[PDB]
Design a protein around this motif. Structure first.
Motif, PDB file in Angstrom:
ATOM      1  N   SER A  41     -81.590  -8.849  12.925  1.00 45.14           N
ATOM      2  CA  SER A  41     -80.494  -7.905  13.074  1.00 45.14           C
ATOM      3  C   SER A  41     -79.588  -7.944  11.849  1.00 45.14           C
ATOM      4  O   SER A  41     -79.728  -8.792  10.963  1.00 45.14           O
ATOM      5  N   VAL A  42     -78.642  -7.010  11.809  1.00 50.53           N
ATOM      6  CA  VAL A  42     -77.724  -6.855  10.686  1.00 50.53           C
ATOM      7  C   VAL A  42     -76.302  -6.998  11.199  1.00 50.53           C
ATOM      8  O   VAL A  42     -75.924  -6.355  12.186  1.00 50.53           O
ATOM      9  N   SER A  43     -75.515  -7.836  10.530  1.00 51.31           N
ATOM     10  CA  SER A  43     -74.107  -8.004  10.852  1.00 51.31           C
ATOM     11  C   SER A  43     -73.302  -8.015   9.561  1.00 51.31           C
ATOM     12  O   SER A  43     -73.674  -8.696   8.602  1.00 51.31           O
ATOM     13  N   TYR A  44     -72.208  -7.262   9.542  1.00 45.42           N
ATOM     14  CA  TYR A  44     -71.309  -7.210   8.400  1.00 45.42           C
ATOM     15  C   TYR A  44     -70.057  -8.027   8.688  1.00 45.42           C
ATOM     16  O   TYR A  44     -69.630  -8.159   9.836  1.00 45.42           O
TER      17      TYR A  44
ATOM     18  N   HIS C  37     -79.518  13.520  18.644  1.00 45.79           N
ATOM     19  CA  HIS C  37     -78.608  12.713  17.840  1.00 45.79           C
ATOM     20  C   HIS C  37     -78.068  11.517  18.618  1.00 45.79           C
ATOM     21  O   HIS C  37     -76.864  11.457  18.898  1.00 45.79           O
ATOM     22  N   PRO C  38     -78.907  10.551  18.982  1.00 46.25           N
ATOM     23  CA  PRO C  38     -78.409   9.347  19.645  1.00 46.25           C
ATOM     24  C   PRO C  38     -77.954   8.295  18.643  1.00 46.25           C
ATOM     25  O   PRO C  38     -78.263   8.351  17.452  1.00 46.25           O
ATOM     26  N   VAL C  39     -77.205   7.321  19.157  1.00 50.50           N
ATOM     27  CA  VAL C  39     -76.787   6.193  18.335  1.00 50.50           C
ATOM     28  C   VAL C  39     -77.981   5.279  18.103  1.00 50.50           C
ATOM     29  O   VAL C  39     -78.677   4.888  19.047  1.00 50.50           O
ATOM     30  N   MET C  40     -78.227   4.939  16.842  1.00 51.06           N
ATOM     31  CA  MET C  40     -79.393   4.162  16.459  1.00 51.06           C
ATOM     32  C   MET C  40     -78.967   2.830  15.858  1.00 51.06           C
ATOM     33  O   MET C  40     -77.933   2.733  15.193  1.00 51.06           O
ATOM     34  N   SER C  41     -79.777   1.804  16.096  1.00 49.08           N
ATOM     35  CA  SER C  41     -79.515   0.464  15.598  1.00 49.08           C
ATOM     36  C   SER C  41     -80.431   0.144  14.422  1.00 49.08           C
ATOM     37  O   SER C  41     -81.351   0.895  14.092  1.00 49.08           O
ATOM     38  N   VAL C  42     -80.169  -0.996  13.790  1.00 54.58           N
ATOM     39  CA  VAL C  42     -80.898  -1.436  12.606  1.00 54.58           C
ATOM     40  C   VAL C  42     -81.529  -2.787  12.898  1.00 54.58           C
ATOM     41  O   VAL C  42     -80.852  -3.702  13.379  1.00 54.58           O
ATOM     42  N   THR C 186     -87.727   4.910  10.617  1.00 54.79           N
ATOM     43  CA  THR C 186     -86.919   5.416  11.715  1.00 54.79           C
ATOM     44  C   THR C 186     -87.840   6.013  12.769  1.00 54.79           C
ATOM     45  O   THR C 186     -88.762   6.767  12.441  1.00 54.79           O
ATOM     46  N   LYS C 187     -87.605   5.652  14.026  1.00 49.88           N
ATOM     47  CA  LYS C 187     -88.418   6.122  15.139  1.00 49.88           C
ATOM     48  C   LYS C 187     -87.676   7.236  15.863  1.00 49.88           C
ATOM     49  O   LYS C 187     -86.583   7.016  16.396  1.00 49.88           O
ATOM     50  N   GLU C 188     -88.267   8.426  15.878  1.00 46.26           N
ATOM     51  CA  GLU C 188     -87.663   9.559  16.556  1.00 46.26           C
ATOM     52  C   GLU C 188     -87.859   9.439  18.065  1.00 46.26           C
ATOM     53  O   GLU C 188     -88.674   8.654  18.557  1.00 46.26           O
ATOM     54  N   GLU C 189     -87.086  10.233  18.809  1.00 45.33           N
ATOM     55  CA  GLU C 189     -87.190  10.204  20.263  1.00 45.33           C
ATOM     56  C   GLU C 189     -88.533  10.736  20.740  1.00 45.33           C
ATOM     57  O   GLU C 189     -89.044  10.290  21.774  1.00 45.33           O
ATOM     58  N   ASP C 190     -89.120  11.687  20.007  1.00 41.10           N
ATOM     59  CA  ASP C 190     -90.417  12.226  20.401  1.00 41.10           C
ATOM     60  C   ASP C 190     -91.523  11.181  20.321  1.00 41.10           C
ATOM     61  O   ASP C 190     -92.507  11.266  21.064  1.00 41.10           O
ATOM     62  N   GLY C 191     -91.383  10.198  19.436  1.00 40.50           N
ATOM     63  CA  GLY C 191     -92.368   9.140  19.336  1.00 40.50           C
ATOM     64  C   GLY C 191     -92.833   8.859  17.923  1.00 40.50           C
ATOM     65  O   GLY C 191     -93.228   7.731  17.610  1.00 40.50           O
ATOM     66  N   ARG C 192     -92.800   9.870  17.059  1.00 41.42           N
ATOM     67  CA  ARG C 192     -93.237   9.681  15.685  1.00 41.42           C
ATOM     68  C   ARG C 192     -92.246   8.806  14.924  1.00 41.42           C
ATOM     69  O   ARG C 192     -91.051   8.770  15.226  1.00 41.42           O
ATOM     70  N   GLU C 193     -92.761   8.087  13.932  1.00 42.50           N
ATOM     71  CA  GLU C 193     -91.971   7.159  13.126  1.00 42.50           C
ATOM     72  C   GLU C 193     -91.862   7.729  11.715  1.00 42.50           C
ATOM     73  O   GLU C 193     -92.747   7.532  10.882  1.00 42.50           O
ATOM     74  N   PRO C 229     -89.286  -8.190   0.771  1.00 44.40           N
ATOM     75  CA  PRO C 229     -90.275  -8.034   1.848  1.00 44.40           C
ATOM     76  C   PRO C 229     -89.703  -7.448   3.124  1.00 44.40           C
ATOM     77  O   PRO C 229     -90.478  -6.973   3.963  1.00 44.40           O
ATOM     78  N   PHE C 230     -88.388  -7.472   3.305  1.00 46.07           N
ATOM     79  CA  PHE C 230     -87.795  -6.985   4.543  1.00 46.07           C
ATOM     80  C   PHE C 230     -87.957  -5.475   4.668  1.00 46.07           C
ATOM     81  O   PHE C 230     -87.772  -4.730   3.703  1.00 46.07           O
ATOM     82  N   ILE C 231     -88.302  -5.030   5.871  1.00 48.91           N
ATOM     83  CA  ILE C 231     -88.476  -3.616   6.180  1.00 48.91           C
ATOM     84  C   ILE C 231     -87.400  -3.220   7.178  1.00 48.91           C
ATOM     85  O   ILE C 231     -87.324  -3.781   8.278  1.00 48.91           O
ATOM     86  N   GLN C 232     -86.572  -2.251   6.801  1.00 50.77           N
ATOM     87  CA  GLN C 232     -85.520  -1.769   7.681  1.00 50.77           C
ATOM     88  C   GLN C 232     -86.112  -0.844   8.735  1.00 50.77           C
ATOM     89  O   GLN C 232     -86.809   0.120   8.406  1.00 50.77           O
ATOM     90  N   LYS C 233     -85.835  -1.137  10.003  1.00 45.30           N
ATOM     91  CA  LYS C 233     -86.321  -0.335  11.116  1.00 45.30           C
ATOM     92  C   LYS C 233     -85.135   0.233  11.879  1.00 45.30           C
ATOM     93  O   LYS C 233     -84.222  -0.507  12.257  1.00 45.30           O
ATOM     94  N   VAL C 234     -85.154   1.543  12.105  1.00 34.20           N
ATOM     95  CA  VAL C 234     -84.078   2.248  12.787  1.00 34.20           C
ATOM     96  C   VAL C 234     -84.633   2.838  14.074  1.00 34.20           C
ATOM     97  O   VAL C 234     -85.648   3.544  14.054  1.00 34.20           O
ATOM     98  N   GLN C 235     -83.968   2.549  15.190  1.00 31.14           N
ATOM     99  CA  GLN C 235     -84.430   2.992  16.496  1.00 31.14           C
ATOM    100  C   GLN C 235     -83.223   3.202  17.393  1.00 31.14           C
ATOM    101  O   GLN C 235     -82.124   2.726  17.104  1.00 31.14           O
ATOM    102  N   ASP C 236     -83.441   3.924  18.490  1.00 30.29           N
ATOM    103  CA  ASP C 236     -82.370   4.170  19.447  1.00 30.29           C
ATOM    104  C   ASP C 236     -81.852   2.833  19.964  1.00 30.29           C
ATOM    105  O   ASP C 236     -82.624   1.905  20.217  1.00 30.29           O
ATOM    106  N   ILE C 237     -80.529   2.744  20.124  1.00 30.41           N
ATOM    107  CA  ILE C 237     -79.901   1.464  20.440  1.00 30.41           C
ATOM    108  C   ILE C 237     -80.380   0.941  21.791  1.00 30.41           C
ATOM    109  O   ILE C 237     -80.557  -0.269  21.975  1.00 30.41           O
TER     110      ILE C 237
END
Ligand code: PIO
Ligand code: PIO
Ligand code: PIO
Ligand code: NAG
Ligand code: NAG
Ligand code: NAG
Ligand code: NAG
Ligand code: NAG
Ligand code: NAG
Ligand code: NAG
Ligand code: NAG
Ligand code: NAG
Ligand code: NAG
Ligand code: NAG
Ligand code: NAG
Lengths: 278, 278, 278
Positions: A41-44, C37-42, C186-193, C229-237
């Protein structure tokens, strides 16, 4: 007396439940830390003042011309290509490249700015009379703290570890690059906190009015500054916010106790039904 | 009647529990907001359309040459170094520097692109005949919304607050820099939402075929575009996702009630044991 | 037998509670995925090795000069402006621009580096004898995987989808730009990334000692490397960390059951009070 003893027993049982939840959470953490590549996770966390970073330059044949600390503004240069006005905490160390053991690299470490709120910045100038290379650039990497390097027992190993870190960049010749460095701290499962940097360069062309005789030499300019006081912290999702895991474990235990109560009621109900039927 | 009254009393007690949890959470939030430098979380939120930003240029002696809005492509220039084709919502304001009160800075604010989905971008051109400076660059900073500045009651103070924000950069002369700005909103504990920008420049050399007579003047080019529709939001970890705190508080209260039940059972058990023994 | 049957019934009721919580969580997720447009986490996730990306160049009239894979160092060029030493997995495809249907763009896709730990990088050289353009640059965009493009059934549509993605940049002529690309999923609500890239360029001037006869042609240099090496992943919270929602739902159900018990006790208490009073 009965009421106060009941309150004391409430405290004892609450403490026992807390201990059990803590033990389960510690077991979960110990099992997690074994597996590789966990979700992080990410924290600032905003900081009023930054710790002084280390900017390890690689001039090679280039000579450092001037180092000075400024605040949110760069005064016009008195005379380009001339030394003087040099006072930075510079430590010179050179060592073998961890990647290619055959080559030794000369590193010039300069203490970085630390007052982000005042927009403190460090301005460096370099000169190179004769160069035999297709591209004119100086390597530089940023590590977490200059003080740690200064008091490190094994200086050579610390620089090799910094080289292993992914914070190396370049700045061009004949341009003044404004480097807005950002701090990213990642905590590994073993316990160490690896540190990597993020930068937002702003390349600016340099116009020289010096005589054509001295145009052969090329001048390097670079400015280092903290972009924002916020420090990005990366940690395992379970360990970063343990309160979520604690809440989940408490919910699971309470659900188990509720299931126990439901079973105690249901066995009585079915026994009564069986007795009534037969 | 008894069943419906029991359901109503269920609703009343559920509402009372919700009120108690809300009061405890509000107390926790009020205690948190007092402490400085809290741990902050990151939340992204895609937007179909961006609010129009403000791009405050600092040409100084430079004259704005052309401003135009384009979509994902820049048509070839009709004639470099010539004015015309200028229509942007530009507001000219100049004020005292908050850092150094002795200097007044001239700011040219240009409305930024807002259709990120259509890859809308703004192209600017600047000219400077005679310049006495080692480095040719124009300062620029980005603030959250152009409309807020336009309707602000105290224009001077708003620009000083923007200067306090960490979103200032530069673009070189003789190069066309593509600026892909990203929006980062951070919510302070006091309540205000500070806004800072992140950029990914793409410096491109400019080849000039103009006659050598006009080569003395230098041309500045810059392009502003939104990198992605996602907006980074930074907030206190407790306040950003209150549902985690609510779940933890509900778990704690249910654990306390379970401890109360355990004490009520245990006191009866020990009383029975004591009576049997003596 | 009674004890073992009670344990079995405990298991049955725990499974039933888990099924109910799962159904409620699935209902919540199905309702969420409908709204826009939902709130997404990291979330970050370190990878030992990267999947090979695709670097779609747009040379246009420019000719690819040399492609080679290196590790953390660039050997000095044998002879600038000369072909040879070319071995990269390059696929040439050209198609209609999704934005402007009237123009066809020629794309040169080059397999990117994949060993981030070894600091693997790809070095490209381009040449252009005659050019009629104010700015000398080559467009390039990065997509998630080269293998996906290679085995894609509809190659043209895949490139158009990549163009829709926000990962397009430029690199200047006469400079060697070091591109440190970062992966953001980033993962959309429909399912595609959907996949987008973040870069940190390092523009370096190129000094040419070639004869003045060949100075008319301009040489393009670019280096691609994975920053970290870190990969940022964004998804619905809610969906990114379902355990928080599960804990909240379990807490809510346990609170409802506690309210039921409180009502059962309170109705008995008030009935007794009413009987005593009247
Ligand atoms: C026990 C009650 C529920 C706890 C679940 C709460 C534990 C929890 O949140 O795990 C998510 C994580 C997902 O893995 P991830 O790839 O995200 O890391 O699971 C595991 O893979 C290892 C779990 C460690 C093993 C757990 C051993 C109990
Ligand atoms: C009360 C039940 C458990 C709640 C714990 C849930 C509260 C919670 O999550 O706090 C984490 C935070 C950690 O501090 P942090 O540096 O991360 O900010 O604690 C505090 O420091 C202040 C707490 C505020 C003071 C809390 C006063 C109750
Ligand atoms: C039910 C117990 C409490 C669950 C609350 C837990 C659900 C939860 O965390 O929602 C936060 C979210 C906030 O919206 P957001 O803008 O952050 O997305 O709510 C909604 O807007 C839709 C909720 C979906 C509709 C929920 C239907 C039950
Ligand atoms: C500045 O330079 C002088 C020597 O010229 C030195 O004595 C002084 O300590 C320096 N100050 C700082 C802050 O570097
Ligand atoms: C650094 O390099 C020099 C030669 O330039 C040589 O003395 C040795 O390799 C190193 N010495 C120092 C000062 O550490
Ligand atoms: C380079 O030297 C180091 C010294 O420790 C050694 O570990 C490494 O194996 C060497 N690599 C070679 C032989 O290329
Ligand atoms: C470079 O040239 C200057 C010209 O004055 C000279 O003073 C200096 O010793 C030379 N050496 C370097 C590399 O600084
Ligand atoms: C474009 O410029 C013309 C004046 O030349 C102006 O009337 C028109 O409103 C402008 N349009 C936009 C969108 O700026
Ligand atoms: C802006 O600067 C000008 C001088 O260049 C002067 O009129 C005053 O300082 C400011 N005026 C305006 C237009 O606000
Ligand atoms: C500069 O002027 C401002 C005007 O408010 C003042 O607050 C500040 O103290 C001054 N700083 C000095 C005297 O350098
Ligand atoms: C700059 O030079 C051009 C040449 O035509 C002239 O028209 C203009 O008035 C001059 N002033 C500026 C700074 O634009
Ligand atoms: C390198 O180039 C040669 C041809 O010159 C080719 O046979 C070989 O497969 C290439 N190797 C790689 C890894 O590209
Ligand atoms: C790509 O462009 C060429 C012309 O340059 C033409 O053959 C056609 O448009 C495309 N052909 C290929 C190789 O796909
Ligand atoms: C461009 O061509 C595409 C082909 O599918 C079409 O969908 C689009 O409407 C066209 N746009 C125009 C007519 O400019
Ligand atoms: C460009 O010039 C070189 C000079 O040797 C020539 O060999 C080549 O065929 C020309 N065409 C291109 C665009 O490569």
């Amino acid at each position: 007396l009965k009421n106060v003893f009941s309150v004391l027993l409430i405290f004892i049982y609450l403490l026992l439940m807390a201990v059990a939840v803590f033990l389960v959470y510690r077991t979960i953490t110990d099992f997690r830390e074994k597996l590789k590549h966990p979700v992080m996770s990410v924290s600032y966390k905003e900081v009023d003042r930054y710790d002084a970073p280390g900017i390890a330059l690689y001039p090679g044949q280039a000579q450092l011309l001037s180092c000075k600390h400024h605040y949110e503004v760069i005064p016009p240069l008195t005379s380009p290509g001339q030394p003087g006005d040099m006072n930075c905490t510079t430590q010179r160390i050179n060592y073998t490249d961890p990647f290619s053991n055959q080559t030794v690299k000369s590193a010039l470490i300069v203490q970085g700015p630390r007052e982000v709120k005042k927009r403190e910045l460090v301005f460096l100038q370099f000169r190179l009379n004769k160069s035999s290379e297709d591209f004119s650039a100086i390597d530089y990497l940023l590590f977490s703290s200059f003080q740690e390097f200064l008091q490190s027992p094994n200086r050579v190993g610390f620089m090799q570890a910094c080289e292993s870190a992914y914070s190396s960049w370049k700045f061009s010749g004949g341009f003044r690059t404004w480097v807005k460095m950002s701090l990213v701290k990642t905590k590994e499962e073993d316990g160490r906190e690896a540190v990597e940097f993020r930068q937002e360069t702003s390349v600016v062309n340099y116009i020289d009015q010096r005589p054509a005789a001295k145009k052969s030499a090329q001048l390097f300019f670079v400015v280092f500054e903290w972009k924002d006081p916020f420090i990005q912290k990366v940690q395992d999702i379970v360990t970063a916010n343990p309160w979520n895991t604690i809440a989940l474990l408490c919910g699971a235990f309470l659900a188990l106790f509720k299931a126990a109560e439901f079973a105690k009621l249901s066995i009585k109900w079915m026994i009564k039904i069986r007795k009534r039927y037969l």
